[PDB]
């Protein structure tokens, strides 16, 4: 309608960022393999995450590098998400969507996404998370005159699904 056309510029859904995370309870040369996996998939150097507390049953110590993660934005994030949704064959559940307008899924095999298996690398999977947003969402991140994004400008759990079905022709099952 007329309202929809005039709202198309600024009230438009887009992917703010794609968050890729690989968590392995070990350190050392084990997670160095995971870092190269994200390096090949995204073209970006990932960053390691340390354990907040010490848990003996998980075999992790405080301040020990455990996970690797990376954030991808732009058309690169669009293409990496397309590959991950391909593996999941465009199928998500309703519970995969949060009340804040975001969603995520998991891929078990990194090899089948983009690359070929190498003898030195492992068998790690990874986690996808999509942070959806609208144009004026950066005012909560800026330093000078920061503000909240308003109530009607936020994304709900419903319109997140609608964007998934309209763009990727996806299916949501209960």
């Amino acid at each position: 309608q007329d309202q929809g056309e005039k709202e198309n510029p600024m009230r438009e859904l887009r992917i703010r960022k794609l968050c890729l995370n690989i968590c392995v309870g070990e350190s050392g040369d084990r997670l160095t393999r995971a870092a190269k996996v994200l390096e090949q998939l995204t073209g970006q150097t990932p960053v390691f995450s340390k354990a907040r507390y010490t848990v003996r049953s998980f075999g992790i110590r405080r301040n020990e590098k455990i996970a690797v993660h990376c954030t991808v934005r732009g058309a690169k994030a669009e293409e990496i998400l397309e590959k991950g949704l391909k593996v999941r064959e465009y199928e998500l559940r309703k519970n995969n969507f949060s009340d804040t307008g975001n969603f995520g899924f998991g891929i078990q095999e990194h090899i089948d996404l983009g690359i070929k298996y190498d003898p030195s690398i492992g068998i790690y999977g990874l986690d996808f998370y999509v942070v959806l947003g609208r144009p004026g969402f950066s005012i909560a991140d800026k330093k000078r005159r920061t503000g909240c994004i308003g109530a009607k400008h936020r994304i709900s759990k419903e319109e997140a699904m609608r964007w998934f079905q309209q763009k990727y022709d996806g299916i949501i099952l209960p």
Binding site: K143, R144, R145, T146, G147
Partner: protein, 293 residues
């Protein structure tokens, strides 16, 4: 009902609102205390600062001192009066920042009678310059930069206006660092790179880079430059001519006030009678509707 409500009645009862300009995100009161407070044995002596604020479309330069009921602006120069001096486009870039600072400096010295005594540095170079007071003459005006919430990094446009003001004749303490020509790996300052930024050569290089690479992208990034016929070759002369114009006539002519018809563009507050009546008819409508059904 699943989880305990955090923003409950008791939460608001003992909530303390921040300062108004803290919760607007405009004033960092940690820096303001250390910047505007005068020593107590300097009774009534004004402490001057130079406010430089870069908005999306304008650069604002002001000189102010603090008083109990509020700041006095002794002088202000905006970047949107640069078309009067020749600069029609790029009113928020480093070159325009230098001009706004220079205009603020010349305008203030003219008011105080020190324009002829303190000429600053007319021949522009990026090198370090500081005004020294002349014996027997009135001393040099001393000011301190107020960068606000701007991240002070090398090449920040607040230091562009600082350079224009110190070149105009104001005594503002600073280091040659944080100017665009400073090098982090060598810890050396190159005045030529700084001078290029003052004349907008880094902008002219971008224009030439875009014309060679993609004409369509060049028009998109520079449309008002083309509409105003600002060629990359004439940018240095345009900024040089603007500097002379500011130095020759820095006085500001106020826009004449026009009497207009007072038309309200906002809703006035409803009175007690209106608010009470509205509840009366809302109650009556609910009773009537429930009776009809």
């Amino acid at each position: 009902g699943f989880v305990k409500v955090v923003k409950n009645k008791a939460y608001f009862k003992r909530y303390q609102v921040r300062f108004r300009r803290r919760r607007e995100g405009k004033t960092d009161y940690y820096a303001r205390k250390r910047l505007v407070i005068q020593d107590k044995n300097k009774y009534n002596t004004p402490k001057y600062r130079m406010i430089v604020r870069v908005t999306n479309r304008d650069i604002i330069c002001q000189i102010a001192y603090a008083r109990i009921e509020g700041d006095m602006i002794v002088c202000a120069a905006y970047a949107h009066e640069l078309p009067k001096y020749g600069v029609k486009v790029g009113l928020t870039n480093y070159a325009a920042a230098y001009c706004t600072g220079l205009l603020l400096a010349r305008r203030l010295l003219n008011r105080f009678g020190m324009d002829k005594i303190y000429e600053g540095q007319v021949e522009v170079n990026g090198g370090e310059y500081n005004v020294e007071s002349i014996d027997g003459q009135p001393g040099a005006f001393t000011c301190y930069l107020d960068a606000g919430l701007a991240r002070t990094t090398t090449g920040n446009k607040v230091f562009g206006a600082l350079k224009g003001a110190v070149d105009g004749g104001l005594s503002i303490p600073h280091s040659t660092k944080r100017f665009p020509g400073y090098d982090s790996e060598s810890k050396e300052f190159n005045a030529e790179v700084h001078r290029k930024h003052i004349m907008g050569q880094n902008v002219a290089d971008y224009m030439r880079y875009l014309m060679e690479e993609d004409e369509d992208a060049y028009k998109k990034q520079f449309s008002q430059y083309i509409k105003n016929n600002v060629t990359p070759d004439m940018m240095e002369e345009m900024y040089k001519k603007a500097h002379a114009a500011i130095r020759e006539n820095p006085v500001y002519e106020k826009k004449p006030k026009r009497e207009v018809k007072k038309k309200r563009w906002n809703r006035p507050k409803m009175s007690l009678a209106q608010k009470k009546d509205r509840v009366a008819q809302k109650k009556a409508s609910f009773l009537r509707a429930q009776e009809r059904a």
